[PDB]
């Protein structure tokens, strides 16, 4: 029952301005683009980058958004966080699944009737060994909007909630509030770029006007994404939060951040320090002139026997390990305690070289802890 609606061309910029909810840019994904006065709408909720924390906004008067999904590409290869809305319940299904590209929910204009409204959500084609089990109180109840902020710090997804009834504004024009209470769901996941989930509760079989004659869609979800700032917030009586003053919004707010206070007396103040950083990394050594005499041990006319093996000592010179290792002429190289990638930074007092003649079956016996001929 999975359907695909990924053929759409969203707005390139998709940028909106938020005053204080600091003063950053949040994506304005619309997912409802009517082609002129007559045409068919297109739904598109592409997977957006997580960017270590994401804030989502509903801005729906009919609860169009029913949660969010998160995790990897969700192709039955890794665990993916899930969140869905039941009739009166909260569903968390963080597990491994391989669902369709576009999540969809079931809605058939469930008005006042004998409870015969058919619905079917296609958001989980398969289900692996689940690791999530938590049910909370569902939240369903001149404007209506809501928001939530998700942040996974590998120990607990300290979610947020903004159930305050924001109104008398187009879309977050000036928010003089700060609230983020929500129930945490501690689980072990490696959540990659996430995606939204919407319910198409706009189809009507008895519309007065054709071509989406309903009042609104309205899948206007605002997502925006985060940065590791150090904004300074002061407590409030009754445990609330009064305002939020950042330490790097502008030079004025940095003065308030270093003074640990909101007001600033007229004068001059020192906040931080500046320092230009280096761009490259250089290491210099004296010129390489006196190479080690390695020709006597690699192109010798004759070699030694087993009982009369010769000993060669190499010292008081420089030995280039890159040319010897990158020769494309040998086939056996094994040792313990050192690695070829660590040979570039190590020095020893003396190097001893030995060579002899062995048989075909006398090559595996050169190893500590073994016996042989």
């Amino acid at each position: 029952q999975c359907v695909n609606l990924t053929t759409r061309t969203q707005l390139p910029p998709a940028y909106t301005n938020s005053f204080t909810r600091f003063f950053s840019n949040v994506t304005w994904f619309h997912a409802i683009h009517v082609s002129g006065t007559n045409g068919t709408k297109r739904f598109d909720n592409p997977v957006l980058p997580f960017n270590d924390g994401v804030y989502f906004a509903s801005t729906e008067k009919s609860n169009i958004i029913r949660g969010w999904i998160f995790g990897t590409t969700l192709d039955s290869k890794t665990q993916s966080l899930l969140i869905v809305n039941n009739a009166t319940n909260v569903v968390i299904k963080v597990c491994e699944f391989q669902f369709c590209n576009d999540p969809f929910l079931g809605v058939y204009y469930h008005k006042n009737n004998k409870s015969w409204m058919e619905s079917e959500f296609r958001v989980y084609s398969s289900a692996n060994n689940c690791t999530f089990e938590y049910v909370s109180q569902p939240f369903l109840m001149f404007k209506n909007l809501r928001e939530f902020v998700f942040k996974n710090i590998d120990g607990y997804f300290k979610i947020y909630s903004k159930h305050t009834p924001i109104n008398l504004v187009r879309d977050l024009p000036q928010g003089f509030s700060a609230l983020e209470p929500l129930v945490d769901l501690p689980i072990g996941i490696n959540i990659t770029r996430f995606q939204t989930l919407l319910a198409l509760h706009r189809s009507y079989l008895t519309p007065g006007d054709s071509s989406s004659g309903w009042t609104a869609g309205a899948a206007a979800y605002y997502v925006g994404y985060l940065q590791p700032r150090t904004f300074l917030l002061k407590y409030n009586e009754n445990g609330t939060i009064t305002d939020a003053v950042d330490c790097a919004l502008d030079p004025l707010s940095e003065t308030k951040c270093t003074l640990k206070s909101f007001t600033v007396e007229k004068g001059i103040y020192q906040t931080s320090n500046f320092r230009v950083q280096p761009t490259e990394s250089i290491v210099r050594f004296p010129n390489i002139t006196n190479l080690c005499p390695f020709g006597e041990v690699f192109n010798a006319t004759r070699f030694a026997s087993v009982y009369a093996w010769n000993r060669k000592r190499i010292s008081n010179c420089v030995a280039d390990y890159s040319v010897l290792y990158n020769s494309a002429s040998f086939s056996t190289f094994k040792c313990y305690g050192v690695s070829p990638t660590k040979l570039n930074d190590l020095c020893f007092t003396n190097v001893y070289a030995d060579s002899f003649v062995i048989r075909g079956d006398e090559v595996r016996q050169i190893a500590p802890g073994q016996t042989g001929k």
Partner: antibody
Amino acid sequence: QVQLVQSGAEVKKPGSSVKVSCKASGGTFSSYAISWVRQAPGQGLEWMGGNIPIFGTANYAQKFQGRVTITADESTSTAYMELSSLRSEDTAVYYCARGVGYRGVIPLNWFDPWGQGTVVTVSS
Amino acid sequence: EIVMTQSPATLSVSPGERATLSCRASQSVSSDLAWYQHKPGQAPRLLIYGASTRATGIPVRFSGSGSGTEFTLTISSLQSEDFAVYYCQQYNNWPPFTFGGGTKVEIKR
């Protein structure tokens, strides 16, 4: 008073691609959702896929991806379906159903109000 | 991919009698069923959509009944021209749609 006109019968050699187009006139072509149904001897009716009415996309079916491509034009009100990769069992008669009228939200797989029918045969 | 079947494969009903067609599905097909009539040399024509409501302009002889995965199609009036191939399509998903084997309407003799 809605009438659907499909393309005539054509013969396509193996290894070639054939496009079949069905045109709808006298009705809400923009609000219609075309589909493809092929019936062949020795087997039941098979539906390759269809176009979503509400959204609009080439919703294929199982064992049909990469073989049949369907595109719909709002201006021309005609849908053309292309077997590319053309074998013997693929020769059948295709039917078009644009007026999906028995389902819930986003009706699909109408199997109703079929077109005239275009005959496609594959031979050397 | 749901599986549906139509029985009997061949039915011999004399003219003026009642013809009964039984449909079944492996999933809940109480409100998801398609009935169409097809003839040789022409594309199939829809007869009943949803197994509960007859199409506009269709003959009143054709009718459908049943609940759940089982559906029954009954014809009050039997005609020689009305005798054709009928099939039931499974609509459990939106995807892929799986039509039934179909039935051949024979003349009793």
